[PDB]
Coordinates of C-alpha atoms and ligand atoms in Angstrom, one line a residue:
X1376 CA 124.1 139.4 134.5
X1377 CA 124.3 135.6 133.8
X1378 CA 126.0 134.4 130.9
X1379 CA 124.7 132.3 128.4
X1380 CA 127.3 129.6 125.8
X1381 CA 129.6 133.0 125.5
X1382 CA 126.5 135.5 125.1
X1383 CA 124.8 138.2 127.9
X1384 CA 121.7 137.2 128.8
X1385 CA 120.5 140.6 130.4
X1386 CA 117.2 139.4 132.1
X1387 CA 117.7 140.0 135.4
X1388 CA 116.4 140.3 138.4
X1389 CA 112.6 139.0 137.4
X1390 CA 114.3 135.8 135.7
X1391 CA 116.7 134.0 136.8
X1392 CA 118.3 130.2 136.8
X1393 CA 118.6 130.1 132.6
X1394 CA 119.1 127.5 130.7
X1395 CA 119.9 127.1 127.0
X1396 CA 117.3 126.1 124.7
X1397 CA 118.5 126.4 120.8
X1398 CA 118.6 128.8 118.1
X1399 CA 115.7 130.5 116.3
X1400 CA 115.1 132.8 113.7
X1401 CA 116.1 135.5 115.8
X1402 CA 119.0 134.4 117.8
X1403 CA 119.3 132.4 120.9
X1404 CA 116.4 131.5 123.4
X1405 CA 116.7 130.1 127.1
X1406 CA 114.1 129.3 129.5
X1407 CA 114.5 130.9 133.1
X1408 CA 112.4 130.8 136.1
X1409 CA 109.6 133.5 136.9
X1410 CA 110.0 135.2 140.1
X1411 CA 106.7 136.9 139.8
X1412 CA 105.0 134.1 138.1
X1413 CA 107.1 131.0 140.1
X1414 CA 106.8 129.1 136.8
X1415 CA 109.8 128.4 133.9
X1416 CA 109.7 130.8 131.0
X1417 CA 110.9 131.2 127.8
X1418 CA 113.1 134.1 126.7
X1419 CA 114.1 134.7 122.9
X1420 CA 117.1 137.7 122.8
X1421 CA 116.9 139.7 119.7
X1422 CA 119.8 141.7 118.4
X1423 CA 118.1 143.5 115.0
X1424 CA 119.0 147.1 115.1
X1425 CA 122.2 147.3 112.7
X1426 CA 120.2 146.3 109.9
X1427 CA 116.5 147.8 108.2
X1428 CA 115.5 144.1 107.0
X1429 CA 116.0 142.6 110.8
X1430 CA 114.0 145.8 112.3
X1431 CA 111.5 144.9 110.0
X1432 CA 111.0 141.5 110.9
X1433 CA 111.6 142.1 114.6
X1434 CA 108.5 144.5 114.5
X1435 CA 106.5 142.9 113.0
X1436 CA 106.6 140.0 115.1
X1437 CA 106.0 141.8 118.4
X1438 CA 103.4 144.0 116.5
X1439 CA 101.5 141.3 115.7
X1440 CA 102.1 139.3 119.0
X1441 CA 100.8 141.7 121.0
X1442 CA 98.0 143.3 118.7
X1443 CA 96.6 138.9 119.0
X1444 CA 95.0 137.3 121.9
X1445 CA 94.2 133.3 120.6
X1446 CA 94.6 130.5 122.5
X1447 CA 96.3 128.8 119.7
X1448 CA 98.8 131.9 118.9
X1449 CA 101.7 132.5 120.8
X1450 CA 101.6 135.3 123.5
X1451 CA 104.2 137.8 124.7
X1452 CA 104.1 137.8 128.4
X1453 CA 106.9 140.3 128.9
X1454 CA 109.5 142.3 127.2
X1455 CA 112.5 143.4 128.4
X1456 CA 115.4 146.0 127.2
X1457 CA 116.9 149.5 128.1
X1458 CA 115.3 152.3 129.6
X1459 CA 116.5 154.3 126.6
X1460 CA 116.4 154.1 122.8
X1461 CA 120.3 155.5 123.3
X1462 CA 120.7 152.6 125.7
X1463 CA 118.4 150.0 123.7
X1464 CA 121.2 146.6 122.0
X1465 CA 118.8 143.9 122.2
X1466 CA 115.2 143.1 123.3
X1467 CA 114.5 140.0 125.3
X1468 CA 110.9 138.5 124.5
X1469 CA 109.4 136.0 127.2
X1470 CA 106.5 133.3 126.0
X1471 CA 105.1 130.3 127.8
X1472 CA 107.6 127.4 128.0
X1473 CA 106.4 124.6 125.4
X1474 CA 107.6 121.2 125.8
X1475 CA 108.2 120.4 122.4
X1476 CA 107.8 122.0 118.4
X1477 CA 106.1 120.0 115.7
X1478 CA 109.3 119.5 114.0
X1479 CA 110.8 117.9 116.9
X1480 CA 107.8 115.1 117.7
X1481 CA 107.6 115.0 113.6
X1482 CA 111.2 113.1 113.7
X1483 CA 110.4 111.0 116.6
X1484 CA 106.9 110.0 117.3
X1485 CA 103.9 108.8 115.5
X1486 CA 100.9 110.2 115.8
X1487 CA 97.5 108.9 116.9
X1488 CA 94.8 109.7 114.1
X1489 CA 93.2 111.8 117.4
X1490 CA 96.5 113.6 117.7
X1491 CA 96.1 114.5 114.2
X1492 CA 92.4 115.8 114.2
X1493 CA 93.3 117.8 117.1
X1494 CA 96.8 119.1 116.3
X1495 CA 95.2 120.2 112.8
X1496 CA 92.0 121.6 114.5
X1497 CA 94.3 123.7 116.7
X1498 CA 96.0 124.9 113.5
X1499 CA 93.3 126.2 111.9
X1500 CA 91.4 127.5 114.7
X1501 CA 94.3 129.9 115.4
X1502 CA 94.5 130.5 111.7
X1503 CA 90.8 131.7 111.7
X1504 CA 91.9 134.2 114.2
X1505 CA 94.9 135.2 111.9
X1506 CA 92.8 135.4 108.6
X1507 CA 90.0 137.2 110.9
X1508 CA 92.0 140.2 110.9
X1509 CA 93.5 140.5 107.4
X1510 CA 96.8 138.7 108.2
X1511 CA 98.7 135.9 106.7
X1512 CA 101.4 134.3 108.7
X1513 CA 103.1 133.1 105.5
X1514 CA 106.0 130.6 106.9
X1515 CA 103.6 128.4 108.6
X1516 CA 105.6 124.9 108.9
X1517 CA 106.3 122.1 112.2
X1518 CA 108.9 124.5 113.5
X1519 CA 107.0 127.1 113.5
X1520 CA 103.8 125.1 115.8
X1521 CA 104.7 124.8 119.1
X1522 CA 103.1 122.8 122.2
X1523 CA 103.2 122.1 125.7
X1524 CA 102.4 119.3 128.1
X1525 CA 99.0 118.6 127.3
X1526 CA 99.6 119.0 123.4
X1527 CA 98.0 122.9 123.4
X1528 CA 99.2 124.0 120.4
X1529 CA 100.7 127.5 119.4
X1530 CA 101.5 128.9 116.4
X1531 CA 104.6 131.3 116.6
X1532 CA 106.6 133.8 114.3
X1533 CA 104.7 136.6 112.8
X1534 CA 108.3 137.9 111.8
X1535 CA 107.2 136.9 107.5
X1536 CA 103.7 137.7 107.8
X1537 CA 101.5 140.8 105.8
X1538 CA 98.4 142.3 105.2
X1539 CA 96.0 140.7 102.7
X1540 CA 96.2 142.1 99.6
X1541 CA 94.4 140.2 96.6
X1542 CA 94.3 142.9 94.0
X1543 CA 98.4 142.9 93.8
X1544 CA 99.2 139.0 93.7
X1545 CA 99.9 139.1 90.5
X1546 CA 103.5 138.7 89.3
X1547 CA 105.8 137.1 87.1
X1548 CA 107.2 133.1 86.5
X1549 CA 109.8 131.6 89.1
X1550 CA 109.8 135.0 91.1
X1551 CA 111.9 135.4 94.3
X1552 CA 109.9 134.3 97.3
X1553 CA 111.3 134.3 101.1
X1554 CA 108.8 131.3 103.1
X1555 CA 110.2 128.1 103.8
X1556 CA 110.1 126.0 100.6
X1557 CA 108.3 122.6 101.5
X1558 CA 105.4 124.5 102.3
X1559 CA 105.2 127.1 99.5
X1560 CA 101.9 127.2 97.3
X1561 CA 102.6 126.1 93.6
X1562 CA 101.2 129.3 92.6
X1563 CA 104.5 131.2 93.9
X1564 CA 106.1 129.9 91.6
X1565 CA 103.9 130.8 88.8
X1566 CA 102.3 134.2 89.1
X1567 CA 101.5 135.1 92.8
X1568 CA 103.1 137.2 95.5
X1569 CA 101.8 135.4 98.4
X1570 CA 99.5 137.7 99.1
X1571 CA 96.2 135.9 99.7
X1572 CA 94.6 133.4 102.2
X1573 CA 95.1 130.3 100.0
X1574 CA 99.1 130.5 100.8
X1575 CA 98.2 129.6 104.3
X1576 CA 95.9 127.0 103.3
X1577 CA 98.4 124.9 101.1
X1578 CA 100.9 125.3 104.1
X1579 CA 98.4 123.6 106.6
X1580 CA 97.9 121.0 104.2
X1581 CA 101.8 120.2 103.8
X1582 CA 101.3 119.7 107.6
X1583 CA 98.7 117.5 107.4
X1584 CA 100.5 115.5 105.2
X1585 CA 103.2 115.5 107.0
X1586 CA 101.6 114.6 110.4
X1587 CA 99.9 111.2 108.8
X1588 CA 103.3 110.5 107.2
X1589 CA 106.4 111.8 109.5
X1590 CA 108.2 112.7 106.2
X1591 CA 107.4 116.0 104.6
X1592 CA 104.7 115.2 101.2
X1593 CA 106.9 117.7 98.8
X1594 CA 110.5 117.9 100.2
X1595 CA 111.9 120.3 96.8
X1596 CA 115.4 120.7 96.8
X1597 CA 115.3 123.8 95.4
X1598 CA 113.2 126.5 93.8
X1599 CA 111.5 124.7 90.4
X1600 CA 112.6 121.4 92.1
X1601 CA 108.9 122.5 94.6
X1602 CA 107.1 122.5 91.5
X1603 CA 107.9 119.3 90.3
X1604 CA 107.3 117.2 93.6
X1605 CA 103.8 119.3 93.8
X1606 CA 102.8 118.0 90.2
X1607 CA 104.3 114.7 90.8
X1608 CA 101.3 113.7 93.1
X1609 CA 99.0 116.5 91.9
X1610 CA 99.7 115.5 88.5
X1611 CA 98.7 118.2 85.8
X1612 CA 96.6 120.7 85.8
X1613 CA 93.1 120.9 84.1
X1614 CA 92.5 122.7 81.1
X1615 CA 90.7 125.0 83.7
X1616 CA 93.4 125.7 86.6
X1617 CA 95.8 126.7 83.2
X1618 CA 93.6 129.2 82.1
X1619 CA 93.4 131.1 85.5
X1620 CA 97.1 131.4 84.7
X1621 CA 97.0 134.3 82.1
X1622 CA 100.9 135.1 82.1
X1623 CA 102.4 133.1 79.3
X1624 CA 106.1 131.9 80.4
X1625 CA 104.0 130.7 84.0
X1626 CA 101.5 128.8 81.7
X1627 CA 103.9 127.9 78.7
X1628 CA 106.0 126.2 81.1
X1629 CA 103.4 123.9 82.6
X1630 CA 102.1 123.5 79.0
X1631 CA 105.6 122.1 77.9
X1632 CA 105.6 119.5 80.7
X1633 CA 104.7 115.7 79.8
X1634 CA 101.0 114.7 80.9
X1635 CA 101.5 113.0 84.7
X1636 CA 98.5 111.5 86.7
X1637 CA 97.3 111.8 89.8
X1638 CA 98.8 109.6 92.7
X1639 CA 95.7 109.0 95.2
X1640 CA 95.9 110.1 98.6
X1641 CA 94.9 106.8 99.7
X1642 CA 97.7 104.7 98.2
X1643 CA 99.9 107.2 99.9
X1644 CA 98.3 107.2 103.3
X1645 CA 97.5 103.9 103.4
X1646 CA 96.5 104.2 107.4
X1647 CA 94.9 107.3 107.1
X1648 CA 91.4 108.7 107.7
X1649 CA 89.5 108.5 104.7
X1650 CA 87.7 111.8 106.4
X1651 CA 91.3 113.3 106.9
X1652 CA 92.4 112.4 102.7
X1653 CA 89.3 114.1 101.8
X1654 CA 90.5 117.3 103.7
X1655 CA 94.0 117.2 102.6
X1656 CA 92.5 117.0 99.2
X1657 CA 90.9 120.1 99.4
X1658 CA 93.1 121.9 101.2
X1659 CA 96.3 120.6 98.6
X1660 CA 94.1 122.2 95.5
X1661 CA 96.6 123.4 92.8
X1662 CA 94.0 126.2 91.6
X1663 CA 93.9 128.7 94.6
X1664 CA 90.7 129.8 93.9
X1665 CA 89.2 126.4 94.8
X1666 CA 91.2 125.9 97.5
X1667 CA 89.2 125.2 101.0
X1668 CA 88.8 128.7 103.0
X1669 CA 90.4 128.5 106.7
X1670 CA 86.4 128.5 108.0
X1671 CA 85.3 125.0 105.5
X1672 CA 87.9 123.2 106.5
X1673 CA 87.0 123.9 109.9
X1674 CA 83.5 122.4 109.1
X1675 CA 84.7 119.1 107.3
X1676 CA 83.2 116.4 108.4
X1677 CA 86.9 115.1 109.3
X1678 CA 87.0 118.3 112.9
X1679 CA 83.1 117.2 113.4
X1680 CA 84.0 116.2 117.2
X1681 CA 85.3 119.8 117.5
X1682 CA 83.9 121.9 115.6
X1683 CA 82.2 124.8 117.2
X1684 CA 81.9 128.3 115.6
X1685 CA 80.7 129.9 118.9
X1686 CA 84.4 128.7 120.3
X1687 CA 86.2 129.8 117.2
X1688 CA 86.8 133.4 117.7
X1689 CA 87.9 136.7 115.4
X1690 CA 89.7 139.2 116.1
X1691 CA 88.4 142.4 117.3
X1692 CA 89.9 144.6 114.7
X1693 CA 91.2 143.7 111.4
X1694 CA 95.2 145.0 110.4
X1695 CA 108.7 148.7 104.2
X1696 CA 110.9 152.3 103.4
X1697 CA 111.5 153.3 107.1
X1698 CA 115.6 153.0 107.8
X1699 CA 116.5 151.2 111.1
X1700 CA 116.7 154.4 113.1
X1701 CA 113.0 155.0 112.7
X1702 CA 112.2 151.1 113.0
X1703 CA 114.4 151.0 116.1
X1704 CA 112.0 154.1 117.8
X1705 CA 108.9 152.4 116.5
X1706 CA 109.9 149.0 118.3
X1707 CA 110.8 151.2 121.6
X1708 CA 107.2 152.3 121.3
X1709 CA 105.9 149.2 121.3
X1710 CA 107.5 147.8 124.1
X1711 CA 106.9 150.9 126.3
X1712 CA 103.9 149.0 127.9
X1713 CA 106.2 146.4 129.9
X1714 CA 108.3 149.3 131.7
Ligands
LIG1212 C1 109.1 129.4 116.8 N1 110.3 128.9 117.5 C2 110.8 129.5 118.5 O1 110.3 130.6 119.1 C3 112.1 128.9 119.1 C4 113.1 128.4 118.2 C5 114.2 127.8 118.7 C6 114.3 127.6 120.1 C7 113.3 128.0 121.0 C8 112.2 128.7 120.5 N2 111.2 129.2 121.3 C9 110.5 128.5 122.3 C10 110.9 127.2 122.7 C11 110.1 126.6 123.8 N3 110.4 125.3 124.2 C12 111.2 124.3 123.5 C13 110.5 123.9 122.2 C14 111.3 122.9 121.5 O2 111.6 121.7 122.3 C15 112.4 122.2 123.5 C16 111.6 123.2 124.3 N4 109.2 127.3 124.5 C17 108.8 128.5 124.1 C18 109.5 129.2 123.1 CL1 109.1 130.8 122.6

């Protein structure tokens, strides 16, 4: 098998010709060439089974992956691994070969104000799809959005996301959370789980932000430290987004803060679409309850030249204890249908 900067790469015969790309979440991912397909690939090796929280992860990304067909989600083309559980190390998951990541052009390149409306049309198109069946990605972020060539956008890594679950958002003041920080809803640090649509929402508007910018809007240093960027251009909350908060320590604390104002949109983005600030606007709403659904922002004024609800599909069908040995059989099941 060929070798890969001191690691196996055991993709053989149908791939060959690898080359290194970087590291994800997951481990190491090349691209090869397709023998079947005659086009170059990318391949993502995953070695999760040791450990209960990386079997978790690792099935619910390929759960989820396969379960989705978007044209704006990431697909799994193949998977590859060991005719055996016994036999099973590692899994080997092929995708289409993007040219770049959101992260990477974010660093580099400005964007055109129709690269915007498109990239963020993309976005939440494949987000309607997500939300359509009861998910919530729940780390969406630039390096998470990935596009090829012709700027098709794909949103990748399922390996964070969950089932809707309103009734049980509820929980206490600065409570643990896992998603990436710069994009986390001000409510997780007061009171919720992340377990509603809104989280996604306040992501893509981080992104938006970001995109008219090139330099994240809320770039926390640490946990509270979100917080205090968020209300530093938010300013405080209303009277009214307080007393949606009933735990005391999460409104106390907000309570004890000095008054701070608002900082427009428009004095920020100076070059932006006035159309586009109106969006971000709703979308970067501290109460979550008034927070623009993944469908209305599709609908603003800003996406008119795309908009099309007839082109904006759902998915057919809507959507923690296990140890590793039963995740490990579970993922063998699921990638039975590539043998
Ligand atoms: C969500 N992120 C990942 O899956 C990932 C992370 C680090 C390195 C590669 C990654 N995957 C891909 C990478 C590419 N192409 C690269 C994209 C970045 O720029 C170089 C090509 N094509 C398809 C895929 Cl699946």
């Amino acid at each position: 098998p060929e070798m890969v900067r001191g690691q196996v790469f055991d993709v053989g015969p149908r791939y060959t010709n690898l080359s290194y790309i970087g590291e994800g979440a997951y481990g190491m991912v090349c691209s090869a060439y397709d023998n079947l397909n005659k086009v170059r690939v990318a391949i993502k090796k995953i070695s999760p089974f040791e450990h209960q929280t990386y079997c978790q992860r690792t099935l619910r990304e390929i759960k989820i992956l396969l379960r989705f067909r978007h044209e704006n989600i990431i697909g799994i083309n193949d998977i590859i691994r060991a005719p055996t559980i016994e036999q099973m190390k590692d899994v080997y998951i092929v995708q289409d070969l993007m040219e770049t990541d959101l992260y990477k052009l974010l660093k580099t390149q400005h964007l055109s104000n129709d690269h915007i409306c498109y990239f963020l049309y993309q976005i939440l198109r494949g987000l309607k799809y997500i939300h359509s069946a009861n998910v919530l990605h729940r780390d969406l972020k630039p390096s998470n959005l990935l596009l090829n060539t012709t700027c098709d956008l794909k949103i990748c890594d399922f390996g964070l996301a969950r089932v809707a679950d309103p009734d049980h958002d509820h929980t206490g003041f600065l409570t643990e959370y896992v998603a990436t920080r710069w994009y986390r809803a001000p409510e997780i640090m007061l009171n919720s789980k992340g377990y509603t649509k809104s989280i996604d929402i306040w992501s893509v508007g981080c992104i938006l932000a970001e995109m008219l910018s090139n330099r994240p809007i809320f770039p926390g240093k640490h946990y509270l430290d979100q917080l205090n960027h968020i209300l530093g251009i938010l300013g405080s909350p209303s009277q009214e987004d307080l007393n949606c908060i009933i735990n005391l320590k999460a409104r106390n604390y907000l309570l004890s803060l000095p008054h701070k104002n608002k900082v427009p949109w428009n004095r920020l983005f100076p070059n932006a679409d006035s159309k586009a600030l109106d969006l971000l606007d709703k979308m970067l709403t501290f109460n979550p309850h008034k927070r623009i659904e993944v469908e209305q922002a599709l609908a603003h004024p800003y996406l008119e030249q795309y908009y099309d609800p007839s082109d904006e599909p759902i998915a057919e069908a809507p959507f923690d204890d296990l140890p590793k040995e039963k995740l490990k059989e579970l993922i063998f099941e699921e990638t039975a249908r590539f043998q």
